[PDB]
PDB file with SEQRES, HELIX, SHEET and CRYST1 records, atoms N, CA, C and O in Angstrom:
SEQRES   1 A   52  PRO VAL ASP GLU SER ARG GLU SER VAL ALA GLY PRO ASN          
SEQRES   2 A   52  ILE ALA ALA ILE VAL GLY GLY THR VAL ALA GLY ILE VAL          
SEQRES   3 A   52  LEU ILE GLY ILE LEU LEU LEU VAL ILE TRP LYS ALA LEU          
SEQRES   4 A   52  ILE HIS LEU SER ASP LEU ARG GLU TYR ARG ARG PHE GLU          
HELIX    1 AA1 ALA A   15  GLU A   47  1                                  33    
CRYST1    1.000    1.000    1.000  90.00  90.00  90.00 P 1           1          
ATOM      1  N   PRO A   1     202.196  75.108  22.708  1.00  0.00           N  
ATOM      2  CA  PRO A   1     202.663  73.976  21.902  1.00  0.00           C  
ATOM      3  C   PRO A   1     202.652  74.284  20.409  1.00  0.00           C  
ATOM      4  O   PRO A   1     201.599  74.264  19.771  1.00  0.00           O  
ATOM      5  N   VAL A   2     203.827  74.569  19.859  1.00  0.00           N  
ATOM      6  CA  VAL A   2     203.953  74.880  18.439  1.00  0.00           C  
ATOM      7  C   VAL A   2     204.895  73.904  17.744  1.00  0.00           C  
ATOM      8  O   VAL A   2     205.685  74.296  16.885  1.00  0.00           O  
ATOM      9  N   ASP A   3     204.807  72.633  18.122  1.00  0.00           N  
ATOM     10  CA  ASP A   3     205.651  71.599  17.533  1.00  0.00           C  
ATOM     11  C   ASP A   3     204.805  70.539  16.835  1.00  0.00           C  
ATOM     12  O   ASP A   3     203.586  70.497  17.001  1.00  0.00           O  
ATOM     13  N   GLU A   4     205.461  69.686  16.054  1.00  0.00           N  
ATOM     14  CA  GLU A   4     204.768  68.627  15.330  1.00  0.00           C  
ATOM     15  C   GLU A   4     205.387  67.266  15.633  1.00  0.00           C  
ATOM     16  O   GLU A   4     206.464  67.182  16.223  1.00  0.00           O  
ATOM     17  N   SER A   5     204.699  66.205  15.223  1.00  0.00           N  
ATOM     18  CA  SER A   5     205.178  64.847  15.454  1.00  0.00           C  
ATOM     19  C   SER A   5     204.816  63.937  14.284  1.00  0.00           C  
ATOM     20  O   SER A   5     203.657  63.558  14.116  1.00  0.00           O  
ATOM     21  N   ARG A   6     205.816  63.593  13.479  1.00  0.00           N  
ATOM     22  CA  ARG A   6     205.605  62.728  12.324  1.00  0.00           C  
ATOM     23  C   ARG A   6     206.148  61.327  12.587  1.00  0.00           C  
ATOM     24  O   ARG A   6     206.872  61.104  13.557  1.00  0.00           O  
ATOM     25  N   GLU A   7     205.793  60.387  11.716  1.00  0.00           N  
ATOM     26  CA  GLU A   7     206.245  59.008  11.855  1.00  0.00           C  
ATOM     27  C   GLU A   7     207.741  58.894  11.573  1.00  0.00           C  
ATOM     28  O   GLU A   7     208.387  59.871  11.196  1.00  0.00           O  
ATOM     29  N   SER A   8     208.282  57.694  11.759  1.00  0.00           N  
ATOM     30  CA  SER A   8     209.702  57.452  11.530  1.00  0.00           C  
ATOM     31  C   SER A   8     209.987  55.957  11.424  1.00  0.00           C  
ATOM     32  O   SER A   8     210.876  55.437  12.098  1.00  0.00           O  
ATOM     33  N   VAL A   9     209.228  55.275  10.573  1.00  0.00           N  
ATOM     34  CA  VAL A   9     209.399  53.840  10.377  1.00  0.00           C  
ATOM     35  C   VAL A   9     209.672  53.514   8.913  1.00  0.00           C  
ATOM     36  O   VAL A   9     209.162  54.183   8.014  1.00  0.00           O  
ATOM     37  N   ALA A  10     210.478  52.483   8.682  1.00  0.00           N  
ATOM     38  CA  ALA A  10     210.816  52.067   7.326  1.00  0.00           C  
ATOM     39  C   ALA A  10     211.668  50.802   7.337  1.00  0.00           C  
ATOM     40  O   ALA A  10     211.298  49.788   6.745  1.00  0.00           O  
ATOM     41  N   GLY A  11     212.810  50.870   8.014  1.00  0.00           N  
ATOM     42  CA  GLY A  11     213.697  49.722   8.088  1.00  0.00           C  
ATOM     43  C   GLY A  11     214.633  49.636   6.898  1.00  0.00           C  
ATOM     44  O   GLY A  11     214.479  48.766   6.040  1.00  0.00           O  
ATOM     45  N   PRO A  12     215.615  50.548   6.846  1.00  0.00           N  
ATOM     46  CA  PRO A  12     216.595  50.593   5.757  1.00  0.00           C  
ATOM     47  C   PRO A  12     217.561  49.412   5.798  1.00  0.00           C  
ATOM     48  O   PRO A  12     217.334  48.439   6.518  1.00  0.00           O  
ATOM     49  N   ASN A  13     218.636  49.506   5.023  1.00  0.00           N  
ATOM     50  CA  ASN A  13     219.636  48.445   4.972  1.00  0.00           C  
ATOM     51  C   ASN A  13     220.259  48.218   6.346  1.00  0.00           C  
ATOM     52  O   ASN A  13     219.766  48.726   7.353  1.00  0.00           O  
ATOM     53  N   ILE A  14     221.344  47.451   6.378  1.00  0.00           N  
ATOM     54  CA  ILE A  14     222.036  47.158   7.627  1.00  0.00           C  
ATOM     55  C   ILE A  14     222.339  48.437   8.401  1.00  0.00           C  
ATOM     56  O   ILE A  14     222.451  48.420   9.626  1.00  0.00           O  
ATOM     57  N   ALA A  15     222.470  49.543   7.675  1.00  0.00           N  
ATOM     58  CA  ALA A  15     222.757  50.831   8.294  1.00  0.00           C  
ATOM     59  C   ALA A  15     221.779  51.127   9.425  1.00  0.00           C  
ATOM     60  O   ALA A  15     222.116  51.824  10.382  1.00  0.00           O  
ATOM     61  N   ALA A  16     220.566  50.594   9.308  1.00  0.00           N  
ATOM     62  CA  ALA A  16     219.540  50.801  10.322  1.00  0.00           C  
ATOM     63  C   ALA A  16     220.053  50.422  11.707  1.00  0.00           C  
ATOM     64  O   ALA A  16     219.987  51.220  12.642  1.00  0.00           O  
ATOM     65  N   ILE A  17     220.562  49.200  11.831  1.00  0.00           N  
ATOM     66  CA  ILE A  17     221.087  48.718  13.102  1.00  0.00           C  
ATOM     67  C   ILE A  17     222.386  49.426  13.467  1.00  0.00           C  
ATOM     68  O   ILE A  17     222.575  49.846  14.609  1.00  0.00           O  
ATOM     69  N   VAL A  18     223.278  49.555  12.490  1.00  0.00           N  
ATOM     70  CA  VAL A  18     224.559  50.217  12.706  1.00  0.00           C  
ATOM     71  C   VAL A  18     224.367  51.598  13.321  1.00  0.00           C  
ATOM     72  O   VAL A  18     224.960  51.916  14.352  1.00  0.00           O  
ATOM     73  N   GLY A  19     223.535  52.415  12.682  1.00  0.00           N  
ATOM     74  CA  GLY A  19     223.280  53.753  13.180  1.00  0.00           C  
ATOM     75  C   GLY A  19     222.599  53.747  14.534  1.00  0.00           C  
ATOM     76  O   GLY A  19     222.924  54.556  15.404  1.00  0.00           O  
ATOM     77  N   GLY A  20     221.650  52.833  14.714  1.00  0.00           N  
ATOM     78  CA  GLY A  20     220.935  52.743  15.973  1.00  0.00           C  
ATOM     79  C   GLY A  20     221.842  52.377  17.131  1.00  0.00           C  
ATOM     80  O   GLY A  20     221.689  52.896  18.236  1.00  0.00           O  
ATOM     81  N   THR A  21     222.789  51.479  16.876  1.00  0.00           N  
ATOM     82  CA  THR A  21     223.722  51.041  17.907  1.00  0.00           C  
ATOM     83  C   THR A  21     224.621  52.186  18.357  1.00  0.00           C  
ATOM     84  O   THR A  21     224.713  52.482  19.549  1.00  0.00           O  
ATOM     85  N   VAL A  22     225.281  52.828  17.398  1.00  0.00           N  
ATOM     86  CA  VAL A  22     226.172  53.943  17.697  1.00  0.00           C  
ATOM     87  C   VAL A  22     225.415  55.086  18.363  1.00  0.00           C  
ATOM     88  O   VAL A  22     225.929  55.734  19.275  1.00  0.00           O  
ATOM     89  N   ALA A  23     224.193  55.328  17.902  1.00  0.00           N  
ATOM     90  CA  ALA A  23     223.364  56.393  18.455  1.00  0.00           C  
ATOM     91  C   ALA A  23     223.001  56.106  19.908  1.00  0.00           C  
ATOM     92  O   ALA A  23     223.055  56.996  20.757  1.00  0.00           O  
ATOM     93  N   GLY A  24     222.631  54.860  20.186  1.00  0.00           N  
ATOM     94  CA  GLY A  24     222.264  54.480  21.538  1.00  0.00           C  
ATOM     95  C   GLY A  24     223.428  54.578  22.505  1.00  0.00           C  
ATOM     96  O   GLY A  24     223.297  55.145  23.590  1.00  0.00           O  
ATOM     97  N   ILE A  25     224.571  54.025  22.111  1.00  0.00           N  
ATOM     98  CA  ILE A  25     225.761  54.053  22.952  1.00  0.00           C  
ATOM     99  C   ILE A  25     226.211  55.484  23.220  1.00  0.00           C  
ATOM    100  O   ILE A  25     226.383  55.884  24.371  1.00  0.00           O  
ATOM    101  N   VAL A  26     226.400  56.250  22.150  1.00  0.00           N  
ATOM    102  CA  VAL A  26     226.827  57.640  22.270  1.00  0.00           C  
ATOM    103  C   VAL A  26     225.829  58.454  23.085  1.00  0.00           C  
ATOM    104  O   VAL A  26     226.215  59.318  23.872  1.00  0.00           O  
ATOM    105  N   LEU A  27     224.545  58.171  22.890  1.00  0.00           N  
ATOM    106  CA  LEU A  27     223.489  58.876  23.607  1.00  0.00           C  
ATOM    107  C   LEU A  27     223.569  58.598  25.105  1.00  0.00           C  
ATOM    108  O   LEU A  27     223.432  59.509  25.922  1.00  0.00           O  
ATOM    109  N   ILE A  28     223.791  57.336  25.456  1.00  0.00           N  
ATOM    110  CA  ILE A  28     223.894  56.940  26.856  1.00  0.00           C  
ATOM    111  C   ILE A  28     225.147  57.520  27.502  1.00  0.00           C  
ATOM    112  O   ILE A  28     225.134  57.897  28.674  1.00  0.00           O  
ATOM    113  N   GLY A  29     226.227  57.586  26.729  1.00  0.00           N  
ATOM    114  CA  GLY A  29     227.474  58.123  27.243  1.00  0.00           C  
ATOM    115  C   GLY A  29     227.399  59.614  27.507  1.00  0.00           C  
ATOM    116  O   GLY A  29     227.708  60.073  28.607  1.00  0.00           O  
ATOM    117  N   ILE A  30     226.987  60.372  26.496  1.00  0.00           N  
ATOM    118  CA  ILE A  30     226.873  61.819  26.625  1.00  0.00           C  
ATOM    119  C   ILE A  30     225.815  62.198  27.656  1.00  0.00           C  
ATOM    120  O   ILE A  30     225.986  63.156  28.410  1.00  0.00           O  
ATOM    121  N   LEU A  31     224.724  61.441  27.682  1.00  0.00           N  
ATOM    122  CA  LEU A  31     223.639  61.695  28.623  1.00  0.00           C  
ATOM    123  C   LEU A  31     224.100  61.474  30.059  1.00  0.00           C  
ATOM    124  O   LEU A  31     223.933  62.344  30.914  1.00  0.00           O  
ATOM    125  N   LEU A  32     224.680  60.307  30.316  1.00  0.00           N  
ATOM    126  CA  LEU A  32     225.168  59.973  31.650  1.00  0.00           C  
ATOM    127  C   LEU A  32     226.315  60.893  32.056  1.00  0.00           C  
ATOM    128  O   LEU A  32     226.508  61.172  33.240  1.00  0.00           O  
ATOM    129  N   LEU A  33     227.071  61.360  31.069  1.00  0.00           N  
ATOM    130  CA  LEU A  33     228.198  62.251  31.323  1.00  0.00           C  
ATOM    131  C   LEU A  33     227.717  63.600  31.845  1.00  0.00           C  
ATOM    132  O   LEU A  33     228.144  64.052  32.908  1.00  0.00           O  
ATOM    133  N   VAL A  34     226.828  64.238  31.092  1.00  0.00           N  
ATOM    134  CA  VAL A  34     226.286  65.535  31.479  1.00  0.00           C  
ATOM    135  C   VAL A  34     225.463  65.427  32.758  1.00  0.00           C  
ATOM    136  O   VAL A  34     225.465  66.338  33.586  1.00  0.00           O  
ATOM    137  N   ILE A  35     224.763  64.309  32.912  1.00  0.00           N  
ATOM    138  CA  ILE A  35     223.937  64.081  34.091  1.00  0.00           C  
ATOM    139  C   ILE A  35     224.797  63.828  35.324  1.00  0.00           C  
ATOM    140  O   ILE A  35     224.513  64.342  36.406  1.00  0.00           O  
ATOM    141  N   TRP A  36     225.848  63.034  35.152  1.00  0.00           N  
ATOM    142  CA  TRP A  36     226.752  62.715  36.252  1.00  0.00           C  
ATOM    143  C   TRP A  36     227.577  63.933  36.651  1.00  0.00           C  
ATOM    144  O   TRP A  36     227.718  64.236  37.835  1.00  0.00           O  
ATOM    145  N   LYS A  37     228.119  64.627  35.655  1.00  0.00           N  
ATOM    146  CA  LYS A  37     228.929  65.814  35.902  1.00  0.00           C  
ATOM    147  C   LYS A  37     228.093  66.921  36.535  1.00  0.00           C  
ATOM    148  O   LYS A  37     228.520  67.560  37.497  1.00  0.00           O  
ATOM    149  N   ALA A  38     226.902  67.142  35.988  1.00  0.00           N  
ATOM    150  CA  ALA A  38     226.005  68.170  36.502  1.00  0.00           C  
ATOM    151  C   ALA A  38     225.492  67.807  37.892  1.00  0.00           C  
ATOM    152  O   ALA A  38     225.349  68.673  38.755  1.00  0.00           O  
ATOM    153  N   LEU A  39     225.219  66.524  38.099  1.00  0.00           N  
ATOM    154  CA  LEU A  39     224.721  66.046  39.384  1.00  0.00           C  
ATOM    155  C   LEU A  39     225.758  66.258  40.483  1.00  0.00           C  
ATOM    156  O   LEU A  39     225.440  66.765  41.559  1.00  0.00           O  
ATOM    157  N   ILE A  40     226.997  65.867  40.203  1.00  0.00           N  
ATOM    158  CA  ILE A  40     228.081  66.017  41.167  1.00  0.00           C  
ATOM    159  C   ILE A  40     228.511  67.475  41.286  1.00  0.00           C  
ATOM    160  O   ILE A  40     228.993  67.905  42.334  1.00  0.00           O  
ATOM    161  N   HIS A  41     228.334  68.229  40.206  1.00  0.00           N  
ATOM    162  CA  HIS A  41     228.702  69.641  40.192  1.00  0.00           C  
ATOM    163  C   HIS A  41     227.717  70.468  41.012  1.00  0.00           C  
ATOM    164  O   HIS A  41     228.119  71.316  41.808  1.00  0.00           O  
ATOM    165  N   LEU A  42     226.428  70.215  40.811  1.00  0.00           N  
ATOM    166  CA  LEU A  42     225.386  70.936  41.533  1.00  0.00           C  
ATOM    167  C   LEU A  42     225.300  70.466  42.981  1.00  0.00           C  
ATOM    168  O   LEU A  42     224.983  71.247  43.879  1.00  0.00           O  
ATOM    169  N   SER A  43     225.583  69.186  43.200  1.00  0.00           N  
ATOM    170  CA  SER A  43     225.537  68.611  44.539  1.00  0.00           C  
ATOM    171  C   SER A  43     226.715  69.095  45.379  1.00  0.00           C  
ATOM    172  O   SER A  43     226.620  69.189  46.603  1.00  0.00           O  
ATOM    173  N   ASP A  44     227.823  69.399  44.712  1.00  0.00           N  
ATOM    174  CA  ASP A  44     229.021  69.874  45.395  1.00  0.00           C  
ATOM    175  C   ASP A  44     228.707  71.089  46.261  1.00  0.00           C  
ATOM    176  O   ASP A  44     229.058  71.130  47.440  1.00  0.00           O  
ATOM    177  N   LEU A  45     228.045  72.076  45.667  1.00  0.00           N  
ATOM    178  CA  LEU A  45     227.683  73.295  46.384  1.00  0.00           C  
ATOM    179  C   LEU A  45     226.559  73.028  47.380  1.00  0.00           C  
ATOM    180  O   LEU A  45     226.428  73.729  48.384  1.00  0.00           O  
ATOM    181  N   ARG A  46     225.752  72.012  47.095  1.00  0.00           N  
ATOM    182  CA  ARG A  46     224.640  71.652  47.967  1.00  0.00           C  
ATOM    183  C   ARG A  46     225.147  71.107  49.298  1.00  0.00           C  
ATOM    184  O   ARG A  46     224.504  71.279  50.334  1.00  0.00           O  
ATOM    185  N   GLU A  47     226.302  70.452  49.263  1.00  0.00           N  
ATOM    186  CA  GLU A  47     226.894  69.882  50.467  1.00  0.00           C  
ATOM    187  C   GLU A  47     227.022  70.937  51.563  1.00  0.00           C  
ATOM    188  O   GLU A  47     226.491  70.771  52.661  1.00  0.00           O  
ATOM    189  N   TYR A  48     227.729  72.019  51.254  1.00  0.00           N  
ATOM    190  CA  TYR A  48     227.930  73.099  52.213  1.00  0.00           C  
ATOM    191  C   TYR A  48     226.593  73.654  52.695  1.00  0.00           C  
ATOM    192  O   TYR A  48     225.538  73.307  52.163  1.00  0.00           O  
ATOM    193  N   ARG A  49     226.648  74.517  53.705  1.00  0.00           N  
ATOM    194  CA  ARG A  49     225.442  75.120  54.261  1.00  0.00           C  
ATOM    195  C   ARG A  49     225.196  76.498  53.655  1.00  0.00           C  
ATOM    196  O   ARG A  49     224.585  77.362  54.285  1.00  0.00           O  
ATOM    197  N   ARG A  50     225.675  76.697  52.431  1.00  0.00           N  
ATOM    198  CA  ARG A  50     225.508  77.969  51.741  1.00  0.00           C  
ATOM    199  C   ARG A  50     224.487  77.847  50.614  1.00  0.00           C  
ATOM    200  O   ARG A  50     224.610  78.505  49.580  1.00  0.00           O  
ATOM    201  N   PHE A  51     223.483  77.001  50.821  1.00  0.00           N  
ATOM    202  CA  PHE A  51     222.442  76.792  49.821  1.00  0.00           C  
ATOM    203  C   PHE A  51     221.739  78.104  49.484  1.00  0.00           C  
ATOM    204  O   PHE A  51     221.291  78.306  48.356  1.00  0.00           O  
ATOM    205  N   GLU A  52     221.647  78.989  50.471  1.00  0.00           N  
ATOM    206  CA  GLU A  52     220.997  80.280  50.280  1.00  0.00           C  
ATOM    207  C   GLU A  52     221.718  81.099  49.212  1.00  0.00           C  
ATOM    208  O   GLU A  52     221.310  82.221  48.914  1.00  0.00           O  
TER     209      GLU A  52                                                      
END                                                                             
């Protein structure tokens, strides 16, 4: 473990919510995208009996 963890609180202007909203939506989209694509992609080969 060679990482650190600092605080992240303040509450800036309206930008606070604006950025948080876009970040959350985009995060959920890209996350679900890679997870869904990878899940169906990895599962595709899993279907067949060539798991070996």
